Amino acid sequence: NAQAEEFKKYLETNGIKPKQFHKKELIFNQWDPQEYCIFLYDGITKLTSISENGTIMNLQYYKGAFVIMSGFIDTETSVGYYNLEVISEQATAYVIKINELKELLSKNLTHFFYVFQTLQKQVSYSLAKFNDFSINGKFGSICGQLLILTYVYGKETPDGIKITLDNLTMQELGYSSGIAHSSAVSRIISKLKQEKVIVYKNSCFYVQNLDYLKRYAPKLDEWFYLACPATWGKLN
Amino acid sequence: NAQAEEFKKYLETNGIKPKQFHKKELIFNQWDPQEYCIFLYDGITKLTSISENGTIMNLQYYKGAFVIMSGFIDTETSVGYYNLEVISEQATAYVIKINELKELLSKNLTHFFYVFQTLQKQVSYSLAKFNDFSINGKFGSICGQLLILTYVYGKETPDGIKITLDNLTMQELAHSSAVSRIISKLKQEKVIVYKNSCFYVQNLDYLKRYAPKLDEWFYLACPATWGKLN
Ligand code: NA
Ligand code: NA
Ligand code: NA
């Protein structure tokens, strides 16, 4: 990712160094009065919110390279009471106090705009998820998640398009599709295996009918086409 | 909104004139090869999309002053097949080609930050809505839409928080039967009341209880407006 590699250079030039986090650590947390800009260079994270009683809500997933800002750029105060949790085994991120970020986006607008554009991708991703859910419900949500996982992590193999993630847990898949409890996911994964859209084998989902997923996640497929044409192009 | 009025002046200083739109017009549409930055100065709009069958979906609502960009700032291509439709009687907007927005935000980083922060409000708004839906379902979504109406248009009165929006506009805010039952249930329970041709919120705490993450979003995003009624 060319724009991401250029942004990594600009940060290191300016003396910001990558940090390594391991699974379950919070890159930023909902109780911290200091807010940050996170350049997630490598790894998979999720955004969570934790209620007073302990219930964890999974709100959004990100993969490196991406940018996540916990505070508004002008006021520097929280945009919501959120954590960024590492769900891959390891992740690498540049962690920038928001006041320090402003100075740096100041003097190089090429990078101001790279971050701007990521927020736009976030916005339209949330709208596409809402639009697919409104039409095809939870079933379409899960198709969407399988679809994007296939675009990003699929390898063509004799068994289908293998979704090549470690510990791709059924529970994590449901959370990414906006569904909390496993009773609903089981139903849907059962139908998808039944109609022979997916298969489970080597700890992995294989996708054997990619067109069926496109069919039920049309607005997320359109988002991927519009926002990630190069990746989309690999399986179209 | 001081930040927004300063942006309006920046636009005009650079020669950009306001355009006027009427209800049901599209300020931008999903078929135009040119994408735009809309500075919606006055009025109420909705973002819409069309499914294969020709069914229209209402995705989001925006009120002046706000910024809505139909294309990515770097590549200038569509963020999604979306239309921006006017819902108030009238709307005033500044309509800027994306390439020209960049040059404009380049010269002035106060206004750069103003626009950037509207994206951030959008992002967080969507997540707050989703969180509320994941706790209380469609009932929470509707409580949350009325909560933001109350904070944005409400004025305290002896009869409660009057919603200072014309009635025709107010009811809309397509025509799902399940939505209409939710609204009328809040009326039945006297959370919002019709009196003397106006609508009054008489139980704000009830709305706050069922749209807690949207209430938090407004506190964090618009603390002064939140504060007026809390
Ligand atoms: Na924080
Ligand atoms: Na357009
Ligand atoms: Na107050």
Numbering used by the authors:
A (entry chain B): 2 to 237
B (entry chain A): 2 to 174, 181 to 237
Share the article's original sentences.
The major regulator of virulence factors in L. monocytogenes is the transcription activator PrfA, a member of the Crp/Fnr family of regulators. PrfAWT is a homodimer in which each monomer consists of an N-terminal domain (residues 1 to 108) and a C-terminal DNA-binding domain (residues 138 to 237) linked by a long α-helix (αC, residues 109 to 137). Glutathione binding stabilizes the DNA-binding helix-turn-helix (HTH) motif in a conformation compatible with DNA-binding, thereby allowing expression of PrfA-regulated virulence factors.
The prfA gene modifications included three previously characterized amino acid substitutions as follows: four of the ten mutants carried the Gly to Ser substitution at residue 145 (PrfAG145S), one carried the Gly to Cys substitution at residue 145 (PrfAG145C), and two carried the Leu to Phe substitution at residue 140 (PrfAL140F). The PrfAG145S, PrfAG145C, and PrfAL140F mutants showed the highest expression levels, followed by PrfAA218G and PrfAL140H. When grown in BHI supplemented with Amberlite XAD4 (BHIA), the wild-type and PrfAL140F mutant strains showed significantly increased expression of ActA compared to bacteria grown in only the BHI. To gain a deeper understanding of the PrfA* mutant proteins, the crystal structures of purified PrfAL140H, PrfAL140F, and PrfAA218G were determined as individual proteins and in complex with the PrfA hly promoter DNA. The PrfAL140H, PrfAL140F, and PrfAA218G PrfA* mutants all had a folded HTH motif in one monomer of the homodimer but an uncollapsed central core structure. Consequently, we suggest that these mutant structures represent an intermediately activated form of the protein with features characteristic of both inactive and activated PrfA. When superimposed on monomer B, the recognition helix in monomer A is shifted up to 6 Å.
